[PDB]
Symmetry: C4
Subunit: 182 residues, 4 copies
């Protein structure tokens, strides 16, 4: 019986995922397990996940715009966006306003936007977009306020889990597989 | 049913948390999962957690003084304190005395102090403060000697879990949520 | 009751493992838990596993050729191959073609090849070799398309688990144990 | 009911732990979760654990000699030994012979030695010492051949778990606690 990201998901959600044209992702706690590795000189590192990376490229490959949105002013996140070919917006005071800006740039509504975050700074956006989603490790204040929770944890495939849903809802999977079968 | 850091907590604890003016935290095993990454030249790194970071800022924002206290002489911990805007005391032979020094600096009693630690060097402080706490990963010798244990593990939101309680006990939640809702 | 990598495995698989002369391994998600540590300048690190290392040497010691195959252009993977004494092929657009090249270099058929991978870029190879395998953390699209799944996760002994099977199927165990018993 | 490392342990083991004068530890997979972090230039790091560190010092503080024994030629392990004040022997071809050498240096028998390891290179020693022990993540070939398994995993307190047993068997705990209570 074939894996389908869509079974056990409600019709309403699948319908929103089908119209997603812009997918935005918090960095820490969402593409990351929330950890910041500090070295002896205070320099910082984060761990991203390759399944998440593969998922994000596939969204881009399926004509969906992908954006990373972080309040931190980190070159890490920028370098990560470059490696996968995604937009990045760094040092953002308000994530809603950032998202709203990206809607105007691509000629989109908020109802065509997906946002994935894990904590308070993501909340303005989570409450404004057509399709908010939170990883399993999300702070309860965010979890409580978003219906769609991934089974997986941030930095352990939660973002891939989202990508798979969106791609499945947009009829993209069969062709993804066919491209990689030879 | 709204998430409340305070349900399933005894009245006595809530009442102590309500009077906390100074919150002190061990570094390793408390804001960290206990791990030290050693590089080929013996240089060390640690992992902090962004939920913990968000929690600590919120304590500071609510007018509660925050301090990190470590026996290790690490620039990591100092850099981390700077990034969040908190006091740091490094290389402490005795944590009780350090805490006691901080009480005098801010004109406080030990009854108005919270301390969170995971192992033996924290014990002198844990036994002296008004509100000791330990994360779930705490050594049993410490666990046994402190009533309040967080559900979460050090470096996986245990400190945020503490911050949430204190903030909740001090009536700070409703406004935290309002600030972030748009 | 002696541990045997071969119990609970079907005869057919054991028989294929017995004829393996070339063992190829994806890097990320297969010898790694899928994580990429990004530093402030975009420099990357990965974590390998020493049990996996011990397994790979033992394959080489038993006269089986070992190869690592990655699409990424990383010096990490090369350095890792050097440390264990195995062939490496980096930056591969198509893994099938790479494998096929290695068959010709060693005068082998695809039926004599094992390939272990976790995600889409491995699929062309997984579908072409005599003995595909996937770790437990493998993406479901890959899992679904390969019968042999290791109990262990990538970067947590999954590759050793494979090595053990192959070595067991090729009668190599008794002597491995004897070499190390004093 | 006070935590006792000794309950649920057989009398025979407790008796051997009571006479331990030399405690030797594999590095990788034993003080580490088996992971090797490779950076872009092939430089390696490992993660040690602070609970393990606290345990090792306490063994030293209780007059037990502690030694780290690795086949790898890593400055990491040396730097780690220095930080905790323990002997280190690096690049060891045969661990039994290394241990045997340390017995003669300290005027001890093999029956007064504890060895903790996780994989084949440790086996010669595990089979020669009075008290072998293996972490929960140990390779089955080693697990099968050693009776004492820690509940915890390497790099997640397995070595502390051992230290606690030995210290408890040697009547050391009460005084350890008393030293840290003020």
């Amino acid at each position: 019986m074939p894996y389908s990201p869509l079974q056990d998901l409600p019709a309403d959600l699948i319908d929103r995922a089908a119209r997603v044209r812009l997918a935005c992702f918090d960095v820490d706690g969402t593409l990351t397990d929330g950890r910041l590795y500090y070295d002896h000189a205070g320099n910082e590192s984060k761990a991203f996940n390759v399944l998440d990376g593969q998922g994000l490229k596939q969204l881009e490959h399926a004509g969906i715009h992908v954006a990373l949105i972080t309040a931190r002013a980190s070159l890490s996140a920028e370098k990560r966006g470059q490696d996968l070919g995604l937009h990045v917006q760094i040092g953002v005071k308000n994530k809603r306003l950032a998202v709203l800006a990206l809607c105007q740039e691509h000629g989109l509504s908020l109802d065509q936007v997906l946002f994935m975050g894990d904590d308070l700074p993501d909340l303005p956006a989570l409450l404004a977009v057509g399709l908010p989603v939170a990883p399993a490790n999300a702070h309860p204040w965010i979890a409580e306020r978003v219906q769609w929770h991934t089974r997986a944890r941030g930095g352990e495939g939660a973002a891939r889990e989202v990508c798979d849903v969106v791609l499945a809802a947009q009829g993209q999977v069969d062709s993804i597989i066919a491209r990689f079968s030879a």
